[PDB]
Each structure stands twice: as structure tokens, then as C-alpha cells.
DNA sequence: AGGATACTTACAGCCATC
DNA sequence: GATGGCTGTAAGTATCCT
């Protein structure tokens, strides 16, 4: 209490001296101190996006928010089905709600409603409890706007089997199976279609109006009449209005739906109950005014297309004048974080500033800063948790100060200096005086940041069996089961794992066996040494000769760079920042240019090198590429001169239009040298390609041709250098030379449009293809289709256009006029033809934004570079993405098809191992003699050892002690404590999950590694009990002791022994000190080892001793 | 052991420019 | 009025090819 709120309309009980989520959860409380529901401003999306969970921490009640359109005013990108399902779900609960809250930003409120006319266009939620017809239902669905298919994935379609028919609901993300029985229906079930399983049995079904707008024949004809009432157009058939007057659907057409009726729909102030109330933040007025400014900017500057009516934004949407004038109807919460003038409306709530929270790892007790503050104030610390692992970590590092809060879920009651905790997710916090405490965590302190063969060093080559629980010699054992010689049964220490690798070879015989230790399996080391001789000598001459290659000085003037680079409208993934900064450091480095990269022809992963175009200015030198086509060539050209426009930018190219007149211009530019760039052609290279001042070059995909052109560009480097890559290189044998010949910047952004990618394969059929079409054509999507470009491609087109009598498939014929294909590319820019396809080497180069799908037609007549090139030319941003394939029957198709099918199964994502996917395929493409002698060996013995001999060869090349140490006879420190302790099967049955955990574990060596894996496993899989925590403390003592190099431990409460490091940082002062202090718990075995004795009853006692004494030893014994 | 088949310069016709 | 020129067929070639 002691604080009030407005109770009439236009009553601004304004608020000052405020805070972040503090005042947010405050107004949550005032939601408790309020009649019904309320709403608020959002200055932007991300703010409330965080803030949802921020208050959800400290609030019993509920709140959600709409989804923003995510398009832009007079853009062309179109919104999603899912956001709009969220929006309806958010709005039509208004007339249903009594308490709880919703939210919205300053922007989507100005957008005018597609109102309850939709809702009032019922139906709505229903059940099976009726003598109910489904023909009638589907009639109400075309009233709603769903349709028929054989299989459906999104809203707007459905499919029957027999007579039972199924669909996708909107308000629920689930798919549903619908359970028809002759009006004697009994059940109704949730279903997932990548599951192909019926899942969760429901009471009811939200049969809301099932589109963005329900649009039937008359609705359509009056949209048509409506445009005709506004303005008039031509009879040209690929006008968007004319097109949809043909009963059709492009993407951004939604943008005219708000002009469906004269009666406008100002914001949703119209809808709420009288009690509901408003909120300020930042500047609604200025945000809105600049919103207007940019919308109308976009209007006039983009008000240029003839086939696209740009429209009166005041007619479309609304303005601040009438917006504040309506919301006069209700009062608000006027909030800003500051002390203010004196007015009875004002609050000036008693919040103050947190202190500075610098804690530098360099120091001794930089931690204490808080602690020294603690005694000086009554403030409890019931503060944020972000996770269960965060609870664990933060508690243990609160034992670094000898405090341990008892997590209190409630908010303000806690004691003066009450030490408790709860969940949080914010960053910035403050101080209070009305409640004399703070709201902080480490954020403000420091912020953040299977049917398997297998190969194994010590004992050979084997295969999967699982894992052998057991009672070890007085303690538990849980070991791995490996299968080799004579049913070699191997129970294996899981702690081993790091010393084992995958099958790492080809399926023929590359895990033959091992029998008796000292044998060929250890001459694995011999051949590691011979690789370390020959190919390391190759590397030696390489980085002797390829390394130096000096260059020039390249002073930055960053200001003009990022003047020119602010325009990048993919607000970057910072890994891209790693990429640019490393490569420009190589640039600014006056030495050899080299950096190897792999990504996608997928946009984003294609253009960042063009930032070096800026670097190709100040030097005032030349660059180029061989775009193997002309199509991508002018694509590049266009986006360059757009991005790179208003300053001395001058390029022409080479095309397939290369007349003698073109060629004269080529002379003109290349012998001018002023001109910036050239862009290649199939017949570019051995032409005497002319340069005066050549900075550098980039290029990709020499695949089916020889490296003829690679050595020939080796001829094209007169006192100058290169900087190239490929998106889909070969086996990295040459690129692993580049791990030694050319460093790598293979960052290529996984994130920033990680979107749905639906890629499958099915048999030859008209109707299934047609189904794919009827998925993509609904906004003018796209697939692509193939042919030999030899036989009757036109009749392919004929059949296709025939099966789709309604659409416009174009002439996708390769080897016709560059003129004609250029027109075709214009239609790709425009899509006069809503559809077109593309086939072979001289056709297929790049992925398009507006496209969404592709299909394959002869993966029975296919090939190697076919796969590995089609993999690059697929992409889409911020919508669903798709693909399918065609097959004849695998009865007909051969091994090769099945190799590619194994590939297909191995297509899931660009996750951690897309490259590993390509690699196992290239084991399926087993014919490498790249590492010629090395190939058979590393296959037989494992590319594990390839990496091993790589590192040893490299480090000992620079150290010159090359042939063999390997730590192969010994590379691991050892430990035991007599702990019945291991991974529990409580959480998971799958053992390959456990293998994964052992992967991250035995691989891990660092505090961040282990704590991060801890947080992962605990939050995903709850507070898993003690023993694996003991395994992790074992991992940490391994971290310390093997950074030190200790040899062995065996432990127990009977005592134990240690083979201490014979080679560490010793200084025996502590040894004679503990002699004088303790002979029992320190009885040194000779000068040699160290037997010890403890009555440490509980394993907690054991580890506590172990921890404190490793710390003691860190201070002393080293 | 090539070999079906995918990139390229030259030969040469028919009619376009002056 | 005469070339020539600009496309098309095809030989040499050198990439698709399992």
C-alpha cells in the first residue's frame, strides 16, 4: 500500500524514480489491485519479449502478448500463419477474459484491426457432442478457407482417408486427427505428422475462423469491385490485383485486406472493458511520429511499381492525433525512471542506483566488493536464479564467501539482510528505500560469456554392445560393452572415453580386429610417424614458402567503413564479426592473404567478403571472380552496386553476351584499370586476363573440372596474392593442408534465419508433386525441377503446365539465349510467371528469397557433384522451407541411389556435424588417395590418429622433434576413490545419450566446460543425484592434476596411494613440513609414491578433504 | 580400359549495313 | 557491292561416370 492508481478516464497518475522489472512486477501487483485486466505499451518487441518471463517470475497471474506482423509498411515480405494464430488467440480472449493481462507495442496498435467481423464470422470452439456432419464442416471450412489435399502441413488445407478427414488447427500449434465414425463418433485426438502418431485425447476443438480473413466468391468479387472503386489497372494478367481477381494468392497481399471495408478499425481500445488501463514507456508520441515518417517515406520512395498499388497510410492505419484522442477514454501508468517535479499525479517511487560491481579475475578478493557492502545495509538478497545449474554454481561460489541462501519464492517479506533466492532473468537492477534492498545477480557483476563399429587405441577395433552395470570390487561398476575378437566382451571404463574414436573407416574391413596388444595396432603409431615424416615435410615446405608472401599497408579509416557498412540489414551474427575481423586483420596484416571458408550460396553466407570491396578502394586496386555463370554474376553485380552505390564504384563484367563489342569494353576497362572488378564466365580464364593493380580475389566451385584452373591462377599471382574458399569443398585432405597452408574462417552462420526446412523423398507421381505445388503456390512460392536439357524439356513443361492448368510455369530451358535467360531472371525478380524450374550445370546456381521449396525428378539419374552442389543452392528467410524428391522404385535404383539415400537420411540440419555428414559420405565415397599412403591407414586405424599425427607433426615441426612421442604408452593421469558412483539410468534408457555425455565429459578439461555441461544436464534432466556429481569432481581434480601432470591415485577410507608427478613444479618444503606434521596421512613410499590414510566416513567427507587439499596443494604443491 | 557424354574454336552459310 | 558476321553444326576436347 501507500501507492495509488488512476480510476477515471484520462487520469494520468504518473510515476517517477522507477526501475526495470521492479516496477513491472509492481504493476503486476496492481493487477491484483485492479478490477479486471489491463494492457501496456511496448516501445518495441524485444523489451516486452523479455519482460513476459521477467514478471512471470514474480506473479501468480498470467499475461501474454500478440505476435507482431514481422513485415514492414510497404515491404514485400509477408507474415506467417503462426504469428497470426497467436494474434487471434490473444484477441478473441478479450471478450472472454476477466483477469490476467495482455501487452502490445507502439507499432501493431497503430495497425488497424481485422476485427471480430472475423470472430463474428464464427464458428468457434466445439466438441464431438452433436449429431454432426463433416461435409457440413468442410463447407464451413471453405467458408473459413481451408481446402483439400492428400496430405497437409499448414493451415488452409486438409486430407481425407476413406472418408475420415483431418486438418491443422490454428489457435493450437498441434496437428489434429479427427476420428470420424458415421455420426457415432467416440474420440478426437491430437496428432503429429513427423510423428505419424495420434497423441493426446481432447475434450474440445477451437473452430475459430480459420484464415487471416474468410474470403469467398462474393468477398472476392467485392474486393475486385472495391479496387475498381478506388482505382483502375490494366488487363495484364500478372498484376497482383488482376491475379487475385483470377482467384489467387501472392504473399504481401495481406497488406490490402485492411482496406477490405470502408469502416476502419482503429486500435483495440474499442474492445476492452471500461476498467482496463494504459501504460507509458519512452515516447509513444515520437516513436509513432517517426513510425509515420518511415511508413510514408517507404510509401513515396517505393510508390513506383505499376503492379503494386501503394496506398493511403491514413486509410490503412492511424495517427497519433486520434490515437491519444481515443485513449483519452482511459487512464494510464506513466512511467519513467527518474525524480521529477512536484505534482500530485507524480510518484517518485523510492528507488536508487545499484553500485558498480567490478570483480576482476586478476585480483585476490575482488569478490568481496559485495560482501563489504553487505554489512552496511539491511538489504536481503532474495535474488535471481536463471537455472538449476545456475543455482548449483551460484551456491558453490557463495560457499566461496561462506553464505548459502535458502531459496524463497516470495518477494518482499524476507528478513533484513535475509539470505534467500528465487528465479530471475534480467540484467540491470537498482536499489530500494521503501523496502531497502536491491535486485541483482552476476549479470550486473560480469554479465555472461547404433549398429556401430568403433576404434580404440590400446586394444584395437570393435563394435557396439551397450554398457555393463556391475558391482566392482567392493563398489559399483558401470562400464561400456564393446564387441570384438572371439566375442571379446570388453567391459570398459567410461572415464576412458576420450581415448576411443568412431569406426573412422570404410565398412569393408577397416575395423578388422585386434588380438594381443603389441602388434600392428600399435604400428598404427609407426605409420603415424611416417605420415609425420612425409606429409609433415610437405607442410614444412608449404609454410616455409606459402607463409611469407608479403603485401602492403592497409590503413583502416574505420569511420568510412562502417558508414558504408551500417547498411547491412542482417543485424549481424557476431560470428560473422569474427569472420570479418579476422580476415581484415589478414588484410591489414601486410603479409600473405589466405583464409579458407565454407558456407552456403544461401544469402548471408555469400556477401560478407564484399566488405573487402571497401578495402579494395583505399588501396585503389582490382578484384574479380569467376562466377561460373553469368546469372549469379549480374546478381552479384546488382546487389553490389545497390549496396556499394554512391561513390567511385565502376564495374563491368563478362557475360554470355560477350560480343566483340563487349570484348572491346573489356579491353577498355582492363586496360583502363580505373575500373574496379570483372566477373567471369565459363570461357574466362586462359584469356590473357589483364591487371595493373590487383588487390585480391574470391571464387568457388571448381568441382567437376580439373584443378587445371587452380594451378593456372597459380600462374596469375605476379608479386600478388589470393583469398578464396569454397562452400562445399572436397575431403579436407587438401583443406587440411590448408590447416597448414591457408587458415580458415568457416564460421558460416548457423543462426539468424534458422527456420523450418522440410526435405523428404517419395516416389514418382503426378498428384504428390501437385500437392507440393499446392503447398508453394499459395503465396507464389517456388520449387525447381530438372531435365537433361537434351530431350523434350518442353514436353516436361507441357506435362507440368498441364497438371497445373492454372499457374504460369516458364521456359527454364538451359542452352538457349543468354538474352532469354536474362528475361527469365527478370521474371524471377518479378514472377510474371508465378512458377519456373531449373536443371543442370549450366542452369542451377543459387537460392532465392521468394522461393520456398525444390524437388528432384531423377535422383535415379544423378551424381556426385549433383548432390554436393544442390546442397548449396537452397535457402529462405523467416518462413517455412521445404523440399521433396522423386524416385522410381529402389528395386530399379542401384547401390548409388542407396548411397545417396543414406545421404538423404543423413540430411537433418546444419547442426554440429554437417561436415561430419559429408565426411561419412566420403567414406561412403571411399575412393580417396589424397593422403595416398595415409588414406588406407587412417581408414584402417582412424582419422582420430590423423588429427593426432597432424597436431604432433605440426607442433614438433615448429619444435623440430618430429617422429614419435605420442603419449601413446601413457597420456592419462589416473585416479580412484572407492566410490559406488557413476551415471544413473534414472533419467534415460538410451546409452548413446550416455555416450554423448561421456563425449562432452572425457573431452572436457576446463571449469567452464564442466560447469556448462552441468547446467545443461541438470536443467534438461533435473537435479540428478550425487554420484555423477562425484564423477565431475573427479573430472575437475583431473583438470588440475593433469595441468600439473600427476600420475595416479587410488583412494578409499581404508586409505590409498598416489603415484605423484615425478615431473611437476615441485619444491619439497611442503614435503618435509608434512613429514614434521603428518607421517600417517602422508607416508611417502620411498621417494617414489605416497600412501595415505583417512577415516573420512562419508563420501562427502572424502571429496571435501580432496577439494580442500587440492587447493592446499595448489597454493603449495605444484 | 576406356567411354558416354558435356565445353569450346573453327567452317561456313545468308542475309544485313553501308 | 561486297564483305562479313553472327549464328548454327560439328570436330577436338576433356567432363560426366557409372
Author numbering: 5 to 453, 479 to 1147
Paper text:
Transcription-repair coupling factors (TRCFs) are large superfamily 2 ATPases that mediate the preferential repair of the transcribed DNA strand (aka transcription-coupled DNA repair, TCR) in organisms ranging from bacteria to humans. At its core, TCR appears universally conserved, and relies on (1) the ability of transcription-repair coupling ATPases to release damage-stalled RNA polymerases (RNAPs) off the nucleic-acid template owing to ATP-driven translocation on dsDNA upstream of the transcription bubble, and (2) on their ability to recruit nucleotide excision repair (NER) machinery. Mfd translocation on dsDNA is central to all Mfd functions.
Our observation that ADP•AlFx enhances the affinity for DNA allowed us to reconstitute stable Mfd-DNA complexes, and prepare specimens suitable for single-particle cryo-EM for structure determination. For our DNA substrate, we chose a 21mer blunt dsDNA fragment, consistent with previously determined Mfd footprints of ~26bp16,26,29. At this resolution, we do not observe density that can be assigned to the transition state analog moiety. First, our reconstruction reveals an unexpected large-scale swiveling motion of the UvrB homology module (D1a-D2-D1b), which results in a ~49 Å displacement and an 82° rotation of D2. Second, particularly striking is the repositioning of domain of unknown function D3, which swings from the ventral side laterally toward D7 upon DNA binding, establishing new bridging interactions with the UvrB homology module and D7. In contrast, when Mfd is bound to DNA, D3 makes contacts with D1a and D7, swapping position with D2.
